[PDB]
Structures are given as structure tokens and as C-alpha cells.
């Protein structure tokens, strides 16, 4: 008398993901309107004008030893924050240019504090562009708040 041996093994099936994955809409902060054109791009510029975050998209260290930032909001004096002649925005790097009056913390070269000025500038309509060494814009970042229309 004797017995044994056996062969069996099969299976398959699972439920993963919920059919694609995107999920749009969440918040709306003014009809943003930025347009990069070069190596550096305006990562994010606080509409309030607290600070200006600039990020590099290029792979080659970008030299900003003269670069500048054009700030034009509403009917005010356009301020051109000229960067230091001893600055270099590495590739894939980022920098934050806080404003004197923005409860920031000078933490260069990354974070910065615009002492010269008191604030980038607030208002519904804001305009922030980047001007390289020469009087030429490389990247722009406009922001318009959804305010009431003139009646």
C-alpha cells in the first residue's frame, strides 16, 4: 500500500488603480501667465510680492553675474532687482529672493533678502520678468487677480 504525489497551481487577478489618475482643479491664484525663454525659469513668484523663487531648467550652471529681475505691478515704480556679479545658478538649482518686508530670513545663496527694497510689491495685477546680463528678458511671470470689471 502506498500513495501520494500531486500537482496543482493556478491563480491571477487583482484590483489596482482606480482607472487612470489625474485629478485636476484645486485652487486658483490669479490668472497666472508666465512664459520662460532661456535656461532659468521663474519657479514661483509670490503674487503678494513676499519673495521671488527662481529655478534653473538648464543642465549647465547658469551665471547670473549681472542678471536682474524686473518687477512691475499696478501703477507703481518698476523695480529692477539686479543680481550680484558674483552669483551662479547651478543647473536644476533654485533661489529665493525674499523682500525686506516679508518676514524672510537671509539664507543665501539659496534664500535672499532684498534689503534695498521693502517689498516686491502687491496688488491684483503684478508683473515679474527676468532680465539677463543684457537688457533682455529670458523668462516672464505675470499674474492677474480675478477682480471686478470696470462698469
Swiss-Prot record:
Disulfide bonds: none annotated. Its main location: nucleus. The keyword Transmembrane does not apply. GO terms for molecular function: structural constituent of nuclear lamina. It comes from the Eukaryota. One of its GO terms (biological process) is DNA double-strand break attachment to nuclear envelope. One of its GO terms (cellular component) is nucleoplasm. Residues 28-145 form the LTD domain. It is found in: Nucleus lamina; Nucleus envelope; Nucleus, Nucleoplasm; Nucleus matrix. Proteolytic cleavage of the C-terminal of 18 residues of prelamin-A/C results in the production of lamin-A/C. The prelamin-A/C maturation pathway includes farnesylation of CAAX motif by protein farnesyltransferase (FNTA and FNTB), removal of the last three amino acids (-AAX) by RCE1/FACE2 and/or ZMPSTE24, methylation of the C-terminal cysteine by ICMT and endoproteolytic removal of the last 15 C-terminal amino acids by ZMPSTE24. Proteolytic cleavage requires prior farnesylation and methylation, and absence of these blocks cleavage. Farnesylation of prelamin-A/C facilitates nuclear envelope targeting. The modification N6-acetyllysine is found at residues 17, 20, 50, 57, 86. The modification Phosphoserine is found at residues 9, 14, 23, 26, 29, 31, 58, 63, 100, 133. A motif (Nuclear localization signal) lies at residues 17-22. Keywords: Acetylation, Coiled coil, Glycoprotein, Intermediate filament, Isopeptide bond, Lipoprotein, Methylation, Nucleus, Phosphoprotein, Prenylation, Ubl conjugation. Disruption phenotype: Mutant mice survive postnatally for 6-8 weeks and show skeletal and cardiac myopathy, sarcopenia, osteopenia, decreased bone formation, neuropathy, abnormal neuromuscular junctions, decreased skeletal muscle growth and decreased muscle satellite cell proliferation. They develop ventricular dilation and cardiac dysfunction. Within 2-3 weeks they show a reduction in their growth rate and by week 4 their growth ceases with their mean body weight being half of that of the wild-type or the heterozygous littermates. Expressed in liver and in bone marrow (at protein level). Expressed in cardiomyocytes. The modification Phosphothreonine is found at residues 16, 96, 105, 110. There is a cross-link at residues 17, 20, 50, 86 (Glycyl lysine isopeptide (Lys-Gly) (interchain with G-Cter in SUMO2)). Homodimer of lamin A and lamin C. Lamin dimers then assemble into dimeric head-to-tail polymers. Ultimately, two head-to-tail polymers assemble laterally into a protofilament with a uniformly shaped rod of 3.5 nm in diameter. Interacts with lamin-associated polypeptides IA, IB and TMPO-alpha, RB1 and with emerin. Proteolytically processed isoform A interacts with NARF. Interacts with SREBF1, SREBF2, SUN1, SUN2 and TMEM43. Interacts with TMEM201. Prelamin-A/C interacts with EMD. Interacts with DMPK; may regulate nuclear envelope stability. Interacts with MLIP. Belongs to the intermediate filament family. This is Prelamin-A/C. It comes from Mus musculus. The gene is Lmna. The chain holds residues 408 to 545 of 665 of the full protein.
Amino acid at each position: 500500500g502506498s500513495s501520494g504525489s500531486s500537482g496543482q497551481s493556478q491563480g491571477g487577478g487583482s484590483v489596482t488603480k482606480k482607472r487612470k489618475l489625474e485629478s485636476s482643479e484645486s485652487r486658483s491664484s490669479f490668472s497666472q501667465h508666465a512664459r520662460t525663454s532661456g535656461r532659468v525659469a521663474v519657479e514661483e513668484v509670490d503674487e503678494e510680492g513676499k519673495f521671488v523663487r527662481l529655478r534653473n531648467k538648464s543642465n549647465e550652471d547658469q551665471s547670473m553675474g549681472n542678471w536682474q529681475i524686473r518687477r512691475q505691478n499696478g501703477d507703481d515704480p518698476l523695480m529692477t532687482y539686479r543680481f550680484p556679479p558674483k552669483f551662479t545658478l547651478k543647473a536644476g538649482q533654485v533661489v529665493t529672493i525674499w523682500a525686506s518686508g516679508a518676514g524672510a530670513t537671509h539664507s543665501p545663496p539659496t534664500d535672499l533678502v532684498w534689503k534695498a527694497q521693502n517689498t516686491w510689491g502687491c496688488g491684483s495685477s503684478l508683473r515679474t520678468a527676468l532680465i539677463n546680463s543684457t537688457g533682455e528678458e529670458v523668462a516672464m511671470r505675470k499674474l492677474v487677480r480675478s477682480g471686478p470689471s470696470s462698469g
